[PDB]
Design a protein around this ligand. Structure first.
Ligand SMILES: [Mg+2]
Ligand SMILES: [Mg+2]
Ligand SMILES: [Mg+2]
Ligand SMILES: [Mg+2]
Ligand SMILES: [Mg+2]
Ligand SMILES: [Mg+2]
Ligand SMILES: [Mg+2]
Ligand SMILES: [Mg+2]
Ligand SMILES: [Mg+2]
Ligand SMILES: [Mg+2]
Ligand SMILES: [Mg+2]
Ligand SMILES: [Mg+2]
Ligand SMILES: [Mg+2]
Ligand SMILES: [Mg+2]
Ligand SMILES: [Mg+2]
Ligand SMILES: [Mg+2]
Ligand SMILES: [Mg+2]
Ligand SMILES: [Mg+2]
Ligand SMILES: [Mg+2]
Ligand SMILES: [Mg+2]
Ligand SMILES: [Mg+2]
Ligand SMILES: [Mg+2]
Ligand SMILES: [Mg+2]
Ligand SMILES: [Mg+2]
Ligand SMILES: [Mg+2]
Ligand SMILES: [Mg+2]
Ligand SMILES: [Mg+2]
Ligand SMILES: [Mg+2]
Ligand SMILES: [Mg+2]
Ligand SMILES: [Mg+2]
Ligand SMILES: [Mg+2]
Ligand SMILES: [Mg+2]
Ligand SMILES: [Mg+2]
Ligand SMILES: [Mg+2]
Ligand SMILES: [Mg+2]
Ligand SMILES: [Mg+2]
Ligand SMILES: [Mg+2]
Ligand SMILES: [Mg+2]
Ligand SMILES: [Mg+2]
Ligand SMILES: [Mg+2]
Ligand SMILES: [Mg+2]
Ligand SMILES: [Mg+2]
Ligand SMILES: [Mg+2]
Ligand SMILES: [Mg+2]
Ligand SMILES: [Mg+2]
Ligand SMILES: [Mg+2]
Ligand SMILES: [Mg+2]
Ligand SMILES: [Mg+2]
Ligand SMILES: [Zn+2]
Lengths: 208, 151, 138, 237
RNA sequence: UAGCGCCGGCCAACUCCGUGCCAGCAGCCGCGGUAAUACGGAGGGCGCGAGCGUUACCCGGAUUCACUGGGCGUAAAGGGCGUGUAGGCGGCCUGGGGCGUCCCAUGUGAAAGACCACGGCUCAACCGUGGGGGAGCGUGGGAUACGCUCAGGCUAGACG
RNA sequence: CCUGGUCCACCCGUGACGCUGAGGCGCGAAAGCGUGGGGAGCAAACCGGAUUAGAUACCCGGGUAGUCCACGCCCUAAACGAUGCGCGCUAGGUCUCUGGGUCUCCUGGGGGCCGAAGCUAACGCGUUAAGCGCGCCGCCUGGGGAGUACGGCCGCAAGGC
RNA sequence: AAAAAUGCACAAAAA
């Protein structure tokens, strides 16, 4: 299924902190502080001028790497975001962002999107009152996502919530923190969320 | 302020009794992404020099590129020798659809959204030279009316 | 002989301009006037005057151009850059209104005969007609 | 004063080249008599106006006109009349690049400077009996070509040519540089690669004296003061 | 449970060893003759992941059958030259008719499918409900510039 | 002697009677073929002498078809301007053939060079277009296999399409 | 207007 295993070797390969991990990527590792170079033997060698395709390849790889999503699923969305009444880059991002697993991390119920996914899929999340297991669920404006009552104790979440105080969620979102719930107000912009990604490149990549 | 991009570097050769002696061409684009671009073809005995005069010659040859919304006024086509470029404008949200040579040129001046096809000889030197003369002849309603008035 | 009197004229002009002649005559006709009518009205020519050469009716057409330019090759721009025949004797081109062209995203004109007379893409699309497409200019 | 009448003109100065004509030149030819194309002097003055005005405008606004001609007719009349306005000129073998390669050709002017530095001045005796004549010889040829060119270490805003055919290069050099081209045009060459046009006999030294004389005056009168007529009739047949 | 393909350029990913025009690779250009990023193992990287590869076939890139959108002096390409059958094309002016063309009106263009919305399965795939429409062809009403046809005039083509 | 095309001047007649042209038909260098004739010079084949390692060649001496005529076939070609035909449009310069004129000059139909614009991959072309356009015909679609095979049609054959 | 035939398979690099 979804990528398993060494994640900070991606942080490194792409050459930007993707924050695919939890807090550790905010500490002085991420792997990124110690060794800000690509993995394996050759990482400390002088780079060569990257190919035009290479450039688009990585940009796409990064963006995908971020939401930690399969190339199958990822391509769907991009084709979905193609036609597209839309500016097509943005549309793609909105959709990516609408993922229940993405939103849950965005709403800080969980620290890492990889942690978000197990959260959704173990029964520890609810959409509009309903239990929802599937990280790929597309949320739309007005949706109330919340920790299910069945386990609201769950040291992990309370820890993630009680520490979520001291934080302010993205504009398109809102979170009531004493109630273990939150709401999806709208679709995030290009502006609304800055990503390391150049979205104009991911499009040029599927131009093939 | 200005931005350089090289689309091509060639080693060519002449023959002397000795053997092959080489020389280097360099194709360079120059532009501010504000609607100014230029193209020049440098040749000297080593790469950097030839990339240097490439940039140099570039700036001494330029073009008015009448963008509107990051695209072009009308659909144009030009031929330079046997090479041909068709330039068609696009709505916003499209992107620049081009092969490496005309992409580079179209990018360094405006043009967030365009449609192109190369036809004929795809030789990049002559396709580049065909693109410049293609921008060069772009015209707007302004030029159009000021062209047909009288007096 | 002249298989295509219209296309001859259009070419007569194309050839005229590119040498920067002030004026050139074409063999005269009711149809060529109605076209040439549209050509001055849209600004591509100053216009024409019926004349006679060796007793024979002509249309002396007065060419239009740009300003003398700077740099080498001072020769002006062109009012008519491009003019080409479309529906021809060899193949006839008949477009319904919905199928009418837009030349250079509107900067150019497409002249076309319809049963409401000789019109333009704009002109024809408004009366709502379509018909035999004569040529395109810009 | 500034302008001129046809009286002195009409004698030697109307029409020159027989059938060697560039056809672009129609407008300025009236009829053909004597097998020789005859220039229409009415339309000369028509132009001689629009031109002179651009000169006078350029003079009283303080900018330069470069004088060129290589023919044996305009060779003398140019050296005089150009220094008379204190202007740059070429009467000798117009060099390639002299405009498009300017910063480079001019490094030969600076060399001319260094060569002047040694005439009677010291350090000249210190050079070998041989190398003397050699270095001096390079000055003497340097002198020949760069006399007129020496002035104006910057490229002009105009150039004035006698035969725009005889120096095409010159015109094209300027034309490439957006440098306005004024010249005294014959049937010999064509209009239209000339910006401001002076349409009359390119040969016939008599004709050259008349036009270039009062062409320099028009500049003097514009910049400040005036002067007496310049030397003309010395040889003159 | 994790596997598979690749890392000479095209094409994203490089180093050691072994081998020595051998064994072998190979989509095209091509690698291997004792230092091989191209063979084989390795470590290491790139890609995709319950899949990854291969073979076969279709379309695309191929304006490389060119209607859109090509060509024919020397690149493939003007018939050895005429005369002429059919067919194709056809100057200037005016009327008739309305065949082509053009406009409106209308019948038909099944359902499914596709496109656009909204919903139903925990999402999705699937699936439901509604919307959007041609083209063509029938009928009816009209238009007549152009092409046609029919009639009449012309001299600029062509013949005498 | 019979006979085709062609151009000029006059501006008289017909009134679009036009262009092109798949098939068809006809013409079609040389060589070749049949039946006669004719045969000097030339000369495939062939012989001889030189040369050479060889010399079934190049050079030399001979030399038969053939070359020539009539009739009848064959239908090919670097049959080339390697450039289909008709028309209109787009600077000039210069040489030349042949008409007409108010015979320096102007004008028309041919034949050559240089060249405007434009074209072209270049070389080049350029009012004798390879420019700008329209009509209609022929043809191209990687190299070899192969202008071969098969079939069909044609030829006396060679052989041709 | 020339006495005189022939030459071993595959093979770098000058980013
Ligand atoms: Mg439990
Ligand atoms: Mg071409
Ligand atoms: Mg290629
Ligand atoms: Mg010199
Ligand atoms: Mg692969
Ligand atoms: Mg690579
Ligand atoms: Mg070894
Ligand atoms: Mg080794
Ligand atoms: Mg080796
Ligand atoms: Mg290796
Ligand atoms: Mg490989
Ligand atoms: Mg290996
Ligand atoms: Mg195709
Ligand atoms: Mg076609
Ligand atoms: Mg082709
Ligand atoms: Mg050929
Ligand atoms: Mg032929
Ligand atoms: Mg017929
Ligand atoms: Mg007709
Ligand atoms: Mg009808
Ligand atoms: Mg249906
Ligand atoms: Mg739903
Ligand atoms: Mg439905
Ligand atoms: Mg009639
Ligand atoms: Mg006769
Ligand atoms: Mg008559
Ligand atoms: Mg009559
Ligand atoms: Mg024969
Ligand atoms: Mg014979
Ligand atoms: Mg025999
Ligand atoms: Mg015989
Ligand atoms: Mg016999
Ligand atoms: Mg005999
Ligand atoms: Mg013998
Ligand atoms: Mg022997
Ligand atoms: Mg013999
Ligand atoms: Mg003999
Ligand atoms: Mg034949
Ligand atoms: Mg042939
Ligand atoms: Mg002639
Ligand atoms: Mg030219
Ligand atoms: Mg084959
Ligand atoms: Mg044969
Ligand atoms: Mg057979
Ligand atoms: Mg044949
Ligand atoms: Mg041998
Ligand atoms: Mg060899
Ligand atoms: Mg080998
Ligand atoms: Zn990290």
């Amino acid at each position: 299924g979804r990528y398993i295993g060494p994640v900070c070797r991606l942080c490194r390969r792409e050459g930007v902190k993707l924050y695919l991990k939890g807090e550790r990527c905010y500490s002085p590792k991420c792997a990124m502080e110690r060794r800000p170079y690509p993995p394996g033997q050759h990482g400390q060698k002088r780079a060569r001028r990257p190919s035009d395709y290479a450039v688009r390849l990585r940009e796409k790889q990064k963006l995908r790497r971020i939401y930690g999503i399969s190339e199958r699923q990822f391509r769907n969305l991009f084709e979905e975001a193609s036609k597209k009444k839309g500016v097509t880059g943005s549309v793609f991002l909105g959709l990516l962002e609408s993922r229940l697993d993405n939103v849950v991390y965005r709403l800080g119920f969980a620290v890492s999107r990889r942690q978000a996914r197990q959260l959704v899929r173990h029964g520890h999340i609810t959409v509009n009152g309903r239990r929802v297991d599937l990280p790929s669920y597309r949320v739309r404006p007005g949706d109330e996502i919340a920790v299910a009552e069945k386990s609201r104790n769950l040291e992990l979440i309370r820890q993630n919530l009680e520490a979520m105080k001291g934080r302010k969620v993205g504009p398109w979102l809102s979170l009531d923190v004493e109630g273990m719930k939150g709401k999806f107000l709208r679709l995030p912009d290009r502006e609304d969320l800055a990503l390391p990604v150049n979205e104009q490149l991911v499009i040029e990549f599927y131009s093939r | 302020d200005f931005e350089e991009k090289m689309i091509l570097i060639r080693r060519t050769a002449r023959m002397q009794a000795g053997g092959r002696r080489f020389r280097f061409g360099a194709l360079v684009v120059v532009g501010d992404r504000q609607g100014r671009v230029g193209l020049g073809f440098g040749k000297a005995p080593e790469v950097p020099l030839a990339v240097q005069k490439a940039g140099y010659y570039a700036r001494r040859n330029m073009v008015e590129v009448p963008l509107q919304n990051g695209t072009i006024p009308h659909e144009i086509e030009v031929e330079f020798g046997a090479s041909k470029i068709v330039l068609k404008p696009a709505a916003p949200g499209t992107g620049v659809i081009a092969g490496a040579v005309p992409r580079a040129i179209l990018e360094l001046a405006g043009v967030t959204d365009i449609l192109t096809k190369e036809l004929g000889s795809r030789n990049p030197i002559n396709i580049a030279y065909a693109t410049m003369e293609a921008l060069r002849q772009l015209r707007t309603k302004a030029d159009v009316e000021r062209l047909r008035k009288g007096e | 002989m002249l298989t295509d009197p219209i296309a001859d004229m259009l070419t007569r002009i194309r050839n005229a301009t590119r040498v920067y002649k002030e004026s050139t005559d074409v063999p005269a006709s009711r149809f060529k006037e109605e076209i040439l009518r549209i050509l001055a009205r849209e600004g591509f020519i100053k216009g024409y005057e019926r004349v006679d050469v060796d007793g024979k009716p002509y249309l002396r057409v007065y060419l239009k151009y740009g300003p003398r330019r700077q740099g080498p090759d001072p020769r002006p721009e062109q009012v008519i850059h491009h003019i080409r025949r479309i529906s021809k004797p060899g193949r006839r081109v008949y477009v319904g209104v919905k199928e009418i062209p837009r030349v250079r995203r509107g900067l150019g004109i497409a002249i076309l005969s319809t049963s409401k007379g000789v019109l333009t893409d704009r002109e024809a699309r408004k009366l709502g007609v379509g018909g035999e497409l004569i040529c395109e200019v810009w | 004063e500034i302008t001129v009448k046809e009286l002195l003109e009409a004698g030697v100065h109307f029409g020159h080249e027989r059938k060697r004509w560039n056809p672009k030149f129609a407008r300025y030819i009236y009829a053909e008599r004597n097998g020789i194309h005859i220039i229409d002097l009415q339309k000369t003055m028509e132009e001689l106006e629009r031109t002179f005005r651009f000169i006078e405008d350029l003079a009283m606004r303080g900018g330069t006109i470069l004088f060129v001609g290589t023919k044996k007719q305009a060779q003398d009349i140019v050296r005089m009349e150009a220094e008379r306005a204190g202007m740059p000129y070429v009467n000798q073998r117009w060099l390639g690049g002299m405009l498009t390669n300017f910063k480079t050709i001019s490094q030969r002017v600076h060399r001319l400077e260094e060569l002047e530095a040694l005439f009677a001045s010291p350090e000249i005796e210190e050079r070998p009996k041989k190398e003397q004549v050699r270095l001096k010889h390079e000055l003497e040829r340097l002198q020949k070509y760069l006399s007129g060119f020496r002035l104006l270490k910057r490229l002009p805003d105009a150039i004035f040519v006698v035969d725009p055919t005889k120096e095409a290069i010159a015109v094209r050099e300027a034309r490439k540089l957006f440098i306005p081209v004024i010249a005294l045009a014959d049937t010999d060459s064509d209009p239209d690669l000339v910006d401001y046009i002076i349409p009359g006999n390119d040969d016939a030294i008599r004709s050259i004296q008349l036009i270039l004389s009062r062409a320099v005056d028009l500049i003097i009168q514009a910049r400040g003061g005036v002067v007496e007529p310049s030397p003309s009739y010395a040889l003159v047949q």
